[PDB]
Amino acid sequence: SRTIKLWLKKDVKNVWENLVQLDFFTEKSAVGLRDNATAAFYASNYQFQGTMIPFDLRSYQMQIILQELRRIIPKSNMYYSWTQL
Amino acid sequence: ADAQRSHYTVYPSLPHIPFVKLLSGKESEVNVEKRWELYHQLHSHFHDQVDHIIDNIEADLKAEISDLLYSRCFNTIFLLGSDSTTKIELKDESSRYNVLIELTPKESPNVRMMLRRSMYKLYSAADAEENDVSYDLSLVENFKRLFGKDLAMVFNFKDVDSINFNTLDNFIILLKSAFKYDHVKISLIFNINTNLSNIEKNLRQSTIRLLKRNYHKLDVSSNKGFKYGNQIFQSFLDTVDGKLNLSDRFVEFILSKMANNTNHNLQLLTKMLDYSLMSYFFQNAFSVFIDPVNVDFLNDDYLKILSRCPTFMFFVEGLIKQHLEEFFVEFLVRENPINGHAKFVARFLEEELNITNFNLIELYHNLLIGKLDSYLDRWSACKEYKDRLHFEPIDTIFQELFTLDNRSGLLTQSIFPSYKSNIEDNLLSWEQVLPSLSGDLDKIMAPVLGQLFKLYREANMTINIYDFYIAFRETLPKEEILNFIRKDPSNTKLLELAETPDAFDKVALILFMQAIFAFENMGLIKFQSTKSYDLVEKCVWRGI
Amino acid sequence: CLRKRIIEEDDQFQNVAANFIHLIVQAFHSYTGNDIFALNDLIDFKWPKYVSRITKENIFEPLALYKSAIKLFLSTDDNLLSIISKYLLIASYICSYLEPRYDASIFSRKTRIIQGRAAYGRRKKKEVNPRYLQPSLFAIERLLAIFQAIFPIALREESLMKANIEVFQNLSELHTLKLIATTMNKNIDYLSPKVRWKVNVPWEIIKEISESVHFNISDYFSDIH
Amino acid sequence: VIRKFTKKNVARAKKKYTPFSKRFKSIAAIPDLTS
Amino acid sequence: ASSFLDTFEGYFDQRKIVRTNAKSRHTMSMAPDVTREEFSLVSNFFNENFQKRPRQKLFEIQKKMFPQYWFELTQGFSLLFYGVGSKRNFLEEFAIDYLSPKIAYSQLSIPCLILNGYNPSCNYRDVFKEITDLLVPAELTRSETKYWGNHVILQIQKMIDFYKNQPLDIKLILVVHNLDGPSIRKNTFQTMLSFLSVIRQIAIVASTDHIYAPLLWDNMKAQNYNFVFHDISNFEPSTVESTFQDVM
DNA sequence: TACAGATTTTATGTTTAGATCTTTTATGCTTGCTTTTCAAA
DNA sequence: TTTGAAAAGCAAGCATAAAAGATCTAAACATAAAATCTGTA
C-alpha cells in the first residue's frame, strides 16, 4: 500500500514445515530428546495431543525472539521495519 | 448365587416352528406349515441372488485393484470410501516374490512397531514359500542375497483416517530409504473413508511431493453409480414378481432410511427387505394364496376379512352405480407387469442411452405414484422416447392382501426406533405401558420412576436434591401409604416401623433414593461433585 | 520427451535445460527455500509440461517459450457423508466455536404461552476470531439440540427431528472417522457424563461440507470480529 | 520355524526343581540328616 | 418456571443463570437417617407388593411376543431389549425356559452362556475362555497369531470363516444382561461380541439401560450386530443390578 | 533298568493396556454494575 | 406512547475440575535351557 506477492496458505504450509525443520519453532511444552532409553520408550508408546489436531492449530513457541531478529537482520532488508513492534 | 457372578453357563432341561395360528386362532396347522415353507422358498431365492451379487462385487473389486496395482518411487493407490474388508490377492510374478503387508492403526503405535511387524511378515512369507535375521530394513537390503529372487512389497493400510498421521508420515519417509536398492519395488494402498483433502493436510508437503510421482485415485464404494444396489432390489422384485406388491410408502421409507446410511447401505437394504418379508409371512393368512395350489380351503373367515377391503368396496360401488369366492380366485392369474416395465426401462437406460447413474428404487417409486416423466426429464436425452417408456400404473382389486406396506409404524419401531424418545414417552405418560385394571394404591399413586420423571421434566437444569425430595413427598398420600404398608401383618419390623411417627419420611425418602440411583444408572441425572451428593444436573430433555 | 518433441514436430538442448532450471529456481526459490530436493521434485513435475509447449518457434528464443509456458511458473501444483452426518458435523463446529449462553438468541423460534424473556445475545462484538484457536468442548445434549435446531424440516407429523438410533450411529461413525474427538483417546467410555466432545476438522472442510448441502454457516460467525 | 525374537545369551544354572518334601515317602521315613 | 419444556427450546430455556439469593443450599444433613436393613426391608416390600398385578399382566402380555423373537433369531437378527425397568427376568425366562428347548426340538438342549454386565468383574478373556470351552474351536496356528496380536479377536475371526461353511444350526444361546454396563461397554468387548454376532450359529439376546446406548455402535458394529429393537418397559425393581452401586 | 521324546519349570525378554500422581489451564460460582425489552398504565 | 423494573449481559477474582502427560506396573505374548515325566523297550 505504500509489488510483493501474497502467497496462499497452501504454499505457506511448506515454508512453515521447513521452519519447524530448521528448529525455529518448537511445539509448546515439548520435552524433546529424552535423557535415557526407558523414558524415550515410554514416550514412544504415547500419542501426544499435538499430533492428532490439524497443523494449523498446533501451538508453537519461538527459539529466536523478535528483539534478536532486529539485531541481526540488516537494516537494508525490506522487512526490517516490521522487526519492531 | 450365579447372578452375583460374571459369566455362567447353564444347560436347560427338555421333556416346532415359530409361526403362529392366524384368523384369531381359526387357521389350520397345514396353512401354517405351508406359510413357513413359502417364506423359506422366497427367502432362500432372494438370498442366493444376494450371495451371487456379493461374490461378484468382491471379485470385481479384486480385479480392478489388481489392474491398478500391476498396470524409484512408490506406486500409490488411494481407495476412496473403502471399509478395509477387501482381500487383495497378488499374482506370482516369475523370479520375484510379491508380499502383501497389512497395517491396522492398532498395529501402528509407532514407526518401530510398524517396521518390526512388516519385516516379520515379510520374512515369514519368504520362508514359507522359499537361520534368522533382525526384523529391520536391512532384510530388504539383503533380500536377494538371502533368497535369490527380488521383491515386490504391497502395503495395505487399513483405516487410514484413524491412524496417527505423524507415525504414518515417518513410516513413509522410512520406506523411502529402500529406493536406493536395485531389486526393490514398493506399492502403497491407502484405504480412505472421508476424502483426499483430509489426508493431504495431515501429511507434510515433502511427503505429498513424494507420493505424487506415481499415484492413482479409485473411488470404490457401495453408492458408486448405484449398480450393486439396484441389482439387490431387482433380485427382490424378481423374487416377488407375480405374487406380491410393493407400496410407494414402503419404497420411500427404503429411500429415506438408505439415505441416512452411506458406508453400509446395501446390507441395510437387505435387512429392511428381509424384515418386510418376515412381517408379511407372519401377519397375513392370505400368504398361502400367492401360489394357485392352496386355493382349495378358503373358509368363512377368509371371505369375511377379504370383504373389508377398500378396492373391493370401490369396485362394488362402481358396479352398483353402473348396473364371491370364484370372483376372488379370478384375481390371481394377472401379471402386474410393473416389475418387467421397470427392468425394461432400466435396460433401455443402460444399454441404449449409456446411462448408468440412476437409482432403480427411486425409479420404482416414481413408477408407483406415476411421476416417471419428471424423473426422466433430468437427463435431457429421453425427450423423444418418453411416451413409449411411460405406462400407467394399473389398479388391481385385492392388491392390499398381497402387499408390503408401511402404515402401522412396525418397520420404524423394530429397525430404526426413536429409542431415547421411546424411553421419554414411557417415563412421562406411563398409563400407555402399565394396564389400568395394593388394590387402592395403584389408582391414586404413580410408579416412582414415572412420578419422578414429571418433576424431573418440570424443574430446571440444576436441581437441589432435598427440594426435589420435598416435591416428590408432596405428591404422595401418606395415609394411604401407611394403610398399604400395614396390609401384611406377618412382618414384625414393618409394623414396628410404620407406627413410628416419621415412617412416611423414611418411606418416601428411600423410594425417592432408589428412583434417583435408577435415574443415575439410566443416565438421566449426574452429580456435580465427586465427594458430595447435594446437587444434581440433568442430561436428558424430552423431544430431542 | 525432449527427443520426441523435436523429431515429431546438443548445446541448444543444454541451453533449454539450463534455462528451465533457472526459471524454476527464479519462480519457486521463495517457496522451497534452499532445498535441493523440493526444487528437484518441482523440476520433475514441471519438465514434461514444459517440453509439451516447445515448438520450432519457441526453441530458439527463450522469452516466447517462457510466455507460452507461463502457467507452470505461477502456481506450485504440488498436490494430490449423509445429510445427518453433515449436519452433525456442522452442529459440532457450532458447539465448539460458540458460547452456550448465546444459543437461546440464535435458534429460538417458538411461540410462548408462559411469560418469559428470550436471551438478548452478546452485547458487544469481540475481536478474537475464534476459528484461529483450538475448539472448545461440548456435551451430547447441546449437540443434539443444535442439530435439531438446524436440521431441515397435521396433528401427527411431528415437525422436529428426534434423536433416534441412526443419528447416534452417524455420530459414532463421525467419532470413528476422527472428525469428532474426545478428551480420551484410548479406553474411551462413550456413555460417561464426564466425557466431552470437540470438532476435529478445520474451517476449510466445513465450508465445502456446508456448501454441499447449501447451509449458511458463514452467517453464524458474522456477528463476531 | 521363524522366531519373533531370539534370546541367544541364556545362561541357565543346573539346579533341580524337586523340593525336599517329595524325596521321601513320609515324615517317619526321613533318615538322620546329621549322619 | 419455564416457557418451554421439551425440544431444543426447552433445553436452551431451562439453562438460565440463577442468582445466589435463590441458591437453594439445602443438604442431605436435613434428612431422616436410614441404614441398610430398614431400607432393604421397606424397599423389597414396595417391590414385591406395589403394582405387582399390572406388572404381571404386562409380563403375560409380552409372553406372546416370544415366537416372534424366536423367528427373528432364526433369521440372523440379534435381539436387543430396551425400556424403563430391569430386564433380567425377561431374558432368563425367554432364553432358558422357552428358546433353548424349542430350538433344540426344531433341529432334531442348547447351552446358554449368561453375561452379567452390571457386574464390573466381567472380562472378555474369561468369557471367551468359556466360549472356547463350549464351542471348542480350532486353535490358532503360528502364522495366524501375527506379531503380538489380540488372540481372542484373531480366533473369533478364524471362527467366522469356519462357521460360514457349516450348517446353519444354533449351537449356543448367548445372553448379555446390561450390554451398556460399566466394564462391559468398552470397545474391545463390543468388538468381540459384534464379531461373535456375525456367526449365524450363535443367537445373541441382549438388553440395555443407558439412554445413550446407540452411541456405542458405529456402522460396522451395527452391521455386525444386526439388531432388531424391542421396547419392553415393565418397571421392574432392578434388585440385582443395584448391588454393585452402594445406594447408601 | 533305560534312553529317546514330550511336557513342565524356571527364567527372561517384548509389547500392550491401564493406573496414579503432578502440573498447568479452563470453568464455574460470587458479587457488583450496566443494558434492554416487557406487562401495565 | 411511555415507563419503570426485572431478565439478562459483562467483568474480576478465587476455588476447583480437568486435560496433558511423566512415571510406572500388570498382563498378554514370546522364547528357551534344564529338569522331569511318559512310553515303550
* Domain presence at residue E29: no
* Shortest CA to C1' contact from D6: nucleotide: G31
As beta bridge partners, residue E204 has E174
Cell digits of residue A76: 537494508
Q: SS3 string of chain C? A: CHHHHHHCCCHHHHHHHHHHHHHHHHHHHHHHCCCHHHHHHHHHHHHHHHHCCCCCCCCCCHHHHHHHCHHHHCCCCCCCCCHHHHHHHHHHHHHHHCCHHHHHHHCCCCCCCCCCCCCCCCCCCCCCCHHHCCCCCECHHHHHHHHHHHCCCCCCCCCCCCCCHHHHHHHHHHHHCCCEEECCCCCCCCCCCCCCEEECCCHHHHHHHHHHCCCCCCCCCCCCC
CA distance E11 to B505: 33
CA distance B510 to E43: 7
Question: Quick one: which of B350, B319, B339 has its CA closest to B240?
Answer: B339
State the DSSP code for B21: P
Q: What is the three-class DSSP state of B184?
A: strand
Q: What is the three-class DSSP state of B286?
A: helix
CA distance A50 to A56: 11
The sheet that has E202-207: what strands, in order across it? Answer: B7-10, E112-116, E172-177, E202-207, E78-82, E227-231
In residues, how long is chain B? 544
Question: Quick one: which of E161, B317, B169, C139 has its CA closest to A17?
Answer: B169
Are the C-beta atoms of residues B332 and B215 closer than 8 Å to each other? no
CA distance B192 to B78: 7
Residues in CB range of C99: below 8 A, 6 or more apart: C122
Other CB atoms within 10 Å distance of the CB of residue E189: 20
Pairing of strands B184-192, B75-80: parallel
CA distance C212 to B512: 50
Question: Quick one: which of E193, E216, E217, E209 has its CA closest to E245?
Answer: E209
Place of cell 438370498: B47
Are the C-beta atoms of residues B419 and E214 closer than 8 Å to each other? yes
User: CA of E152 and C1' of G27: distance in angstroms?
Assistant: 15
- Which residues of chain C does A52 touch, with a Cβ-Cβ cutoff of 8 Å? 178, 181, 185, 200
Q: Do B162 and C177 touch (CB under 8 A)?
A: yes
As beta bridge partners, residue C138 has C197
Which amino acid, C10? D
Technique used to solve these coordinates: cryo-EM
CA distance B488 to E45: 10
Query: Degrees (nearest 5) of the Cα angle B416, B418, B423?
Result: 135
DSSP string, E149-167: --HHHHHHHHHHHHHTTS-
Q: Do C116 and E218 touch (CB under 8 A)?
A: no
Q: How far is CA B413 from CA B408, C164, C165, in A?
A: 9, 10, 11
Protein-covered nucleotides of chain G (CB closer than 7 Å) are 7-11, 17-24, 28-37
Residues in CB range of B462: below 8 A, 6 or more apart: B528, B535, B536, B537, E18
Whether D20 CB is under 7 Å from strand F: no
Are the C-beta atoms of residues B158 and B193 closer than 8 Å to each other? no
- In this structure, the dihedral spanned by the alpha carbons of residues B10, B14, B19 and B25, taken in order and rounded to 10 degrees, is -130
Which amino acid, B64? E
Are the C-beta atoms of residues E111 and B9 closer than 8 Å to each other? yes
Beta strand ranges found along E73-111 (DSSP E): 78-82
Measured in whole angstroms, how far is the alpha carbon of residue B336 from the centre of its chain?
A: 31
CA distance C159 to C83: 17
Are the C-beta atoms of residues C5 and C37 closer than 8 Å to each other? no
Please list, residue by residue across E56-75, b when 16 or more beta carbons sit within 10 angstroms of its beta carbon and e when fewer do. Answer: eebeeebeeebebbbbbbbb
Question: Quick one: which of B209, B192, B128, B127 has its CA closest to B157?
Answer: B192
Please list, residue by residue across B377-389, b when 16 or more beta carbons sit within 10 angstroms of its beta carbon and e when fewer do. Answer: eeeeebeeeeeee
Which amino acid, B140? V
Residues in CB range of B330: below 8 A, 6 or more apart: none
- Which residues of chain C does B543 touch, with a Cβ-Cβ cutoff of 8 Å? 160, 162
Are the C-beta atoms of residues B345 and B389 closer than 8 Å to each other? yes
Question: Quick one: which of E206, E135, E138, E220 has its CA closest to E169?
Answer: E135
Q: What is the three-class DSSP state of A4?
A: coil
Place of cell 460374571: B6
Question: Quick one: which of B161, C205, B261, B254 has its CA closest to E217?
Answer: B261
Q: Does B194 touch chain E (CB under 8 A)?
A: no
Place of cell 446407540: E214
Indicate if the alpha-carbon torsion angle C159, C161, C164, C169 is positive or negative.
positive
State the DSSP code for B390: -
Cα distance from C224 to chain E (closest Cα, Å)? 21
- In this structure, the dihedral spanned by the alpha carbons of residues A19, A20, A24 and A30, taken in order and rounded to 10 degrees, is 170
- Which residues of chain B does D4 touch, with a Cβ-Cβ cutoff of 8 Å? 120, 135
Cell digits of residue B489: 401383618
Place of cell 512388516: B118
CA distance E65 to E94: 10
**CB within 8 Å of chain B, chain E residues 38-57:** 38-39, 41-43, 45-46, 49-55, 57
CA distance C198 to C195: 10
Residues in CB range of E118: below 8 A, 6 or more apart: E177, E178, E181, E240, E241, E243, E244
Which amino acid, C84? I
CA distance B214 to B74: 7
Are the C-beta atoms of residues E144 and B31 closer than 8 Å to each other? no
Which amino acid, B361? I
- Could you give the number of structural domains in chain E? 1
Q: Do C141 and E11 touch (CB under 8 A)?
A: yes
Cell digits of residue C95: 458447539
Are the C-beta atoms of residues E176 and E205 closer than 8 Å to each other? yes
Minimum-distance residue to G6 (CA–C1') = C117
For chains A and D, having 3+ Cβ pairs within 8 Å is answered no
Other CB atoms within 10 Å distance of the CB of residue A49: 12
State the DSSP code for E98: I
Give break positions in chain B: residue before each, C–N beyond 2.5 Å: 15, 71, 130, 323, 437
The sheet that has B525-527: what strands, in order across it? Answer: B462-464, B535-538, B525-527
- Which residues of chain C does B526 touch, with a Cβ-Cβ cutoff of 8 Å? 193
* Domain presence at residue E163: yes
Are the C-beta atoms of residues B273 and B46 closer than 8 Å to each other? yes
* Domain presence at residue E13: no
> Does an H or E element contain A26, and which?
strand A25-27
CA distance B222 to E83: 34
CA distance B440 to E111: 44
Which residue segment(s) compose the domain that E107 sits in? 51-248
Q: SS3 string of B27-75? A: CCHHHHHHHHHHHHHHHHHHHHHHHHHHHHHHHHHHHHHHHHHHCCCCE
Q: How far is CA B228 from CA B4, B59, B85, B223, C80, in A?
A: 49, 13, 17, 8, 29
Cα distance from B114 to chain D (closest Cα, Å)? 14
Place of cell 527459539: A63
Residue in chain C lying closest to A11 (CA): C31
> Residue C169 is nearest to which of E9, E186, E214, comparing CB atoms?
E214
Q: How far is CA C103 from CA B306, C145, C178, in A?
A: 56, 10, 26
CA distance B184 to B180: 9
Pairing of strands E112-116, E172-177: parallel
Phi, psi for B155 (deg, rounded to 5): -95, 125
Cell digits of residue A28: 509448546
> Residue A45 is nearest to which of B110, B165, B202, comparing CB atoms?
B110
User: CA of C220 and C1' of G1: distance in angstroms?
Assistant: 35
Q: What is the three-class DSSP state of B98?
A: strand
Are the C-beta atoms of residues B203 and A16 closer than 8 Å to each other? no
Place of cell 420435598: B470
Gap between the terminal Cα atoms of chain E: 32
* Domain presence at residue E60: yes
Phi, psi for C199 (deg, rounded to 5): -80, 145
Residues in CB range of B391: below 8 A, 6 or more apart: B341
CA distance E248 to E242: 11
Angle between helices B503-522 and B465-473 (to 10 degrees): 120
- Burial group, residue B146, by CB count within 10 angstroms (0-12, 13-18, 19+): middle
Q: What is the three-class DSSP state of D10?
A: coil
Place of cell 396433528: C155
Beta strand ranges found along B399-495 (DSSP E): 403-404, 462-464
Q: SS3 string of B229-252? A: HHHHHHHHHHHCCCCCEECHHHHH
Query: Degrees (nearest 5) of the Cα angle B250, B251, B255?
Result: 120
Are the C-beta atoms of residues E207 and E80 closer than 8 Å to each other? yes
Residues in CB range of A80: below 8 A, 6 or more apart: A70, A73, A74
Residue in chain B lying closest to A13 (CA): B205
State the DSSP code for B160: G
Q: Do B194 and C139 touch (CB under 8 A)?
A: no
* Domain presence at residue E113: yes
CB-hemisphere CA count at 13 Å for B261? 24
In residues, how long is chain C? 225
Cell digits of residue B40: 423359506
Place of cell 468382491: B58
Q: How far is CA C19 from CA B221, C14, C51, C55, C77, in A?
A: 46, 8, 12, 16, 20
Which amino acid, E167? P
Pairing of strands B7-10, E112-116: antiparallel
State the DSSP code for E179: T
* Domain presence at residue E37: no
Indicate if the alpha-carbon torsion angle E83, E88, E89, E90 is positive or negative.
positive
Query: Degrees (nearest 5) of the Cα angle E186, E190, E192?
Result: 120
CA distance E182 to E191: 16
Are the C-beta atoms of residues B235 and B53 closer than 8 Å to each other? yes
State the DSSP code for B103: E
Residues in CB range of B185: below 8 A, 6 or more apart: B75, B150, B151, B152, B153
Are the C-beta atoms of residues E85 and B515 closer than 8 Å to each other? no
In residues, how long is chain E? 248
Angle between helices B448-457 and B419-428 (to 10 degrees): 100
Residues in CB range of B432: below 8 A, 6 or more apart: B425, B426
